[PDB]
Design a protein around this nucleic acid. Structure first.
Ligand SMILES: [Mg+2]
Ligand SMILES: [Mg+2]
Ligand SMILES: [Mg+2]
Ligand SMILES: [Mg+2]
Ligand SMILES: [Mg+2]
Ligand SMILES: [Mg+2]
Ligand SMILES: [Mg+2]
Ligand SMILES: [Mg+2]
Ligand SMILES: [Mg+2]
Ligand SMILES: [Mg+2]
Ligand SMILES: [Mg+2]
Ligand SMILES: [Mg+2]
Ligand SMILES: [Mg+2]
Ligand SMILES: [Mg+2]
Ligand SMILES: [Mg+2]
Ligand SMILES: [Mg+2]
Ligand SMILES: [Mg+2]
Ligand SMILES: [Mg+2]
Ligand SMILES: [Mg+2]
Ligand SMILES: [Mg+2]
Ligand SMILES: [Mg+2]
Ligand SMILES: [Mg+2]
Ligand SMILES: [Mg+2]
Ligand SMILES: [Mg+2]
Ligand SMILES: [Mg+2]
Lengths: 148, 52, 99, 193, 203
RNA sequence: UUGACCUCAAAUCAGGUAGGAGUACCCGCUGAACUUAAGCAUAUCAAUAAGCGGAGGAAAAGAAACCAACCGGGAUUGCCUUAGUAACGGCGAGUGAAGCGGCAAAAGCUCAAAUUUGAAAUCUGGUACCUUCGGUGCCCGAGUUGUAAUUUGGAGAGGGCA
RNA sequence: UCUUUGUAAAGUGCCUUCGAAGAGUCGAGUUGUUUGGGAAUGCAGCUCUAAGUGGGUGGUAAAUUCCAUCUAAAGCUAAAU
RNA sequence: ACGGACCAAGGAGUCUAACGUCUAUGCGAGUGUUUGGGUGUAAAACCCAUACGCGUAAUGAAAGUGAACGUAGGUUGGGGC
RNA sequence: UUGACAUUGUGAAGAGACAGUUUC
């Protein structure tokens, strides 16, 4: 709201907080990103290194949906089971009846291995899996089945 | 015209304020301070029969 | 042919039960017909050859198919059309020479 | 001008943009108008349910093929399997899509069963006669909702053969990457006696 | 029928028969007025497949148009601006000569509606076109459900608004990624892409 | 000599139609510079203002010579996104879409290319009458250099069978 | 309240042959313009100019193999805007 | 040195898109009802599905790969207990 | 202003090089 702004406080003071000498003007250093290589060079190089120049190769007509692959870590793997079967599965870790977790249905593309799942067998269905994530699942007694 | 006129409020904060206002309706001092002539009401909250 | 069942590889993708939909009548847009083969033959023997077709036939007789294909690629727009046109000139020369 | 430590902004406002500012002051009014239009159309076509029955289809791309959704219309094969013509289905409220094809048996059976359910739950008034009483249901979509098929059971046995799914993915990637160069190498090796 | 032979023979434009016919006809057309009525279609099969029918209310006009570029009509070639806009000689009209032909015929025959047009001939100086028009006032057109759509006032001067086949091509009205700038009208697409949309509850 | 045909004319011939206005929105054409780049020419402003032609209550677009690369979607339009992204750019300043997904609304179709050939089955007009947004009889004309029926690719058509 | 009509009209299954589908157009070169479209996004001028198991497209130019997808160069159409 | 003969009334850091720091609030590995739908005492209030945005993973030009040796380590300080 | 292609066709000679092509 206007009543809380410094404009109200500056009424009666000539320069309105802009200074008598500097004397607020239109665009004293140029407009937008003018002078990035010439008179704004120090700011550009200190705060935005890498701004100028090209790196890498172009990708014509890139579709982001090709690269859809959300990641899920093992430490969050057990949140894909609803909490009301969660404790029932956590006790009585059974190889003959182990929970099936469909991470693609949950909306994930790759299982990563940030690690320390409980020592309980689970069948993890995933499109992709990291080597360590698979080793930890097998160490817990489960299995990774690949899906598409 | 493209000045902002409507203000978005989080649904949960809206429900928070509504719940607080409802609970304030049951405080006799709050209603009296707010300006209602409830000095002779039997009890607050005032519940009447469903016949109304 | 069939999907492997994994997210990468030569035949990646889910394995589902195939059905082989019935063929559309389109996809036969370019198919020849007896009506059209007769019409095109009659019109060809009525009208004759274009000047560049005459040049192509002369080039096939004298210089060979490689130079004929180069000239036909210049006259038409593409190498594939040049190859088809040179093949059709070759059939014309063979039919005019045979028997 | 550039000063202080701030992100580089890209506010695209260097054209006559104030001439083309659309403020949706009429959001509530158009919601009311849409509701009035729906009520008017429902009354006009009563007791028809305001929308055609739609098939179930698989969404394309790797990002969405895990989901099914409503399609445009049933295929000619699906309508024929359900036992009716496309011309009549369009007159009894079935959306028909001539350009979609069936290559997936599970989708095909799901859509055929969807048409069977519709024909079992529908009442068609005779072209000439006394119409029976029929309350207007407004939504075919709400009457025949789209359901995501069940992909697996809740729990079963662990069947492990130590094949290292990670190794499987690595080997599939390598086989695809080197399929062409191996075919060429075999071709010259075969040529050289 | 014979229309198939006509269709196939018309494609043989550099055969001796068509070279002779084209030379004689181009001289005949050049002798007549720039726009003149044609008693019958020169290419009846082409007119048929463009929608002409041999009934009362269908009219054919023949028109020739000058070939070449569009010279910028500035005095003495002086363009008073930046060097990028200094060109005069190598500039091209954004509509085809067949669109110019259709529009001039429609202006001559404002009581009619331009249905279609086709190429018939050309020399170094002129391209020659034949325009099919339909009389919206003829009862033979007002009846005949297959054609009274063109009596609707929304089809007035469709050649002037670019609604014919050549008009839609020059407007770029086609499907796919090659026509992103022009599917629903390029100025409409530009307005849509350059409109700032603000909601009541700001997003 | 007479009668046709073709092409081209004339009439204050019978009946019609166009022009101009408005122009907020719409479909095209033509088309700047101020400006920004702290100078300036490519660039930007802007495929904009001005100029010109053409509509309607909406216009335009529209039932894929589409999108995709999936387990595939499925006319067009619009909103929310995609995304200030892919990309373009003295690669500087700046500029910058599209597929997928949710939603509003949903609607599909028509000719040309095919001998009715045991029957131009088609149509304007005039005239008389009538139940007059028209109908019937009669006549002239148009039309075979093709008007009707039949088919439009999703198909469909000749034959046989039911 | 009248009415009329089936040898009208339409629909469906099996067997056979067939199945016509738009050219100075597509496409190519070049010039100009335009686009985010980058060995060239669209448009236009000039020159060249196709085919029919063909043609277009598949966002790096080219040759050789496939594969996928649609069916241009003719036309109509309400609503959501 | 420049403006000011006098008086009344008017008279100049605003709004918007995107964003930085800080602060308040809600909820929290989540969070955001208001594109839209439902509903209404009707531009209000109330209610809601699926998506989508940002966040919970980074790094590389990219193909790609992807976070516990150990009481999630040792040493030195460290408020409080 | 100069060249090329198109407008642009038809006879011969005959520089020829060589069933024919090709510039001249
Ligand atoms: Mg002070
Ligand atoms: Mg003062
Ligand atoms: Mg001052
Ligand atoms: Mg200053
Ligand atoms: Mg410098
Ligand atoms: Mg410039
Ligand atoms: Mg008169
Ligand atoms: Mg400047
Ligand atoms: Mg300056
Ligand atoms: Mg200057
Ligand atoms: Mg203007
Ligand atoms: Mg009007
Ligand atoms: Mg329209
Ligand atoms: Mg079609
Ligand atoms: Mg679509
Ligand atoms: Mg983003
Ligand atoms: Mg631009
Ligand atoms: Mg029939
Ligand atoms: Mg076609
Ligand atoms: Mg221009
Ligand atoms: Mg249209
Ligand atoms: Mg001074
Ligand atoms: Mg003074
Ligand atoms: Mg004064
Ligand atoms: Mg005052």
């Amino acid at each position: 709201p206007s009543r809380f702004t410094k404009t109200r406080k500056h009424r009666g003071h000539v320069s309105a907080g802009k200074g008598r000498i500097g004397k607020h003007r239109k665009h004293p250093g140029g407009r937008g990103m003018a002078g990035g290589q010439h008179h704004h060079r120090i700011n550009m190089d200190k705060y935005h290194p890498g701004y100028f120049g090209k790196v890498g190769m172009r990708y014509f007509h890139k579709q982001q949906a090709h690269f859809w692959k959300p990641v899920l870590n093992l430490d969050k793997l057990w949140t894909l089971i609803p909490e009301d079967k969660r404790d029932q599965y956590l006790k009585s870790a059974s190889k003959e009846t182990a929970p099936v977790i469909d991470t693609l249905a949950a909306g994930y593309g790759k299982i990563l291995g940030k690690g320390r799942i409980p020592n309980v067998p689970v069948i993890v269905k995933a499109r992709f899996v990291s080597k360590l994530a698979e080793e930890k699942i097998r160490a817990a007694g489960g299995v990774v089945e690949l899906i598409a | 015209t493209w000045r902002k006129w409507n203000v978005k409020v989080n649904h949960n904060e809206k429900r928070y304020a509504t719940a607080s206002a409802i609970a304030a309706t049951a405080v006799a001092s709050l209603v009296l301070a707010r300006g209602h002539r409830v000095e002779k009401i039997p009890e607050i909250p005032l519940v009447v029969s469903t016949d109304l | 042919t069939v999907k492997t069942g994994i997210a990468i590889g030569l035949n990646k993708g889910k394995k589902v039960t195939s059905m082989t939909p019935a063929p559309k009548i389109s996809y036969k847009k370019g198919a020849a017909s007896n009506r059209t083969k007769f019409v095109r033959s009659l019109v060809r023997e009525i009208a004759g050859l274009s000047p560049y077709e005459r040049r192509l036939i002369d080039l096939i007789r004298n210089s060979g198919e490689k130079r004929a294909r180069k000239v036909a690629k210049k006259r038409l727009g593409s190498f594939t059309r040049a190859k088809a046109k040179v093949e059709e000139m070759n059939n014309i020369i063979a039919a005019s020479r045979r028997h | 001008a550039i000063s202080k430590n701030l992100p580089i902004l890209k506010n695209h406002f260097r054209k006559h943009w104030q001439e083309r500012v659309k403020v949706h002051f009429d959001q509530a009014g158009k919601k009311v108008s849409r509701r009035n239009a729906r009520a008017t159309r429902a009354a006009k076509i009563a007791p028809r349910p305001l929308d055609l029955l739609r098939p179930v289809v698989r969404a394309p791309t790797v990002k969405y093929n895990r989901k099914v959704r409503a399609g445009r219309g049933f295929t000619l094969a699906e309508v024929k399997a359900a036992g009716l013509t496309a011309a009549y289905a369009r007159t009894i409220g079935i959306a028909v899509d001539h350009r979609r094809q069936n290559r997936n048996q599970e989708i095909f059976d799901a859509n055929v069963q969807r048409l069977k359910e519709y024909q079992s739950k529908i009442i068609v008034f005779p072209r000439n006669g006394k119409a029976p009483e029929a309350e207007q249901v407004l939504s075919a979509a709400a009457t025949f909702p789209i359901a995501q098929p069940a992909t697996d059971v809740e729990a079963r046995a662990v069947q492990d053969n130590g094949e290292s799914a990670f190794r499987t993915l690595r080997l599939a990637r390598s086989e695809k990457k080197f399929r062409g160069i191996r075919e060429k190498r075999a071709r010259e090796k075969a040529e050289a006696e | 029928g014979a229309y198939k032979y006509l269709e196939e023979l018309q494609r043989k434009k550099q055969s001796d028969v068509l070279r002779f016919l084209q030379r004689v006809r181009v001289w005949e057309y050049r002798q007549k007025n720039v726009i003149h009525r044609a008693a019958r279609p020169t290419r009846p099969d082409k007119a048929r497949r463009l929608g002409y029918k041999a009934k009362q209310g269908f009219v054919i006009y023949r028109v020739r148009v000058r070939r070449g570029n569009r010279k910028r009509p500035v005095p003495k070639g002086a363009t008073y601006g930046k060097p990028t806009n200094q060109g005069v000689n190598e500039l091209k009209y954004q509509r085809s000569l067949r669109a110019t032909a259709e529009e001039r015929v429609g202006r001559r025959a404002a009581n009619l509606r331009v249905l279609n047009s086709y190429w018939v001939n050309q020399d170094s100086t002129y391209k020659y076109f034949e325009v099919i028009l339909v009389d919206p006032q003829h009862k033979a057109i007002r009846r005949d459900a297959r054609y009274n759509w063109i009596c609707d006032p929304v089809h007035k001067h469709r050649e002037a608004r670019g609604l014919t086949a050549t008009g839609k091509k020059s407007r770029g009205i086609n499907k796919g990624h090659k026509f992103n700038n022009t599917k629903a009208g390029r100025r409409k697409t530009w307005k849509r892409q350059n409109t700032l949309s603000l909601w009541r509850y700001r997003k």
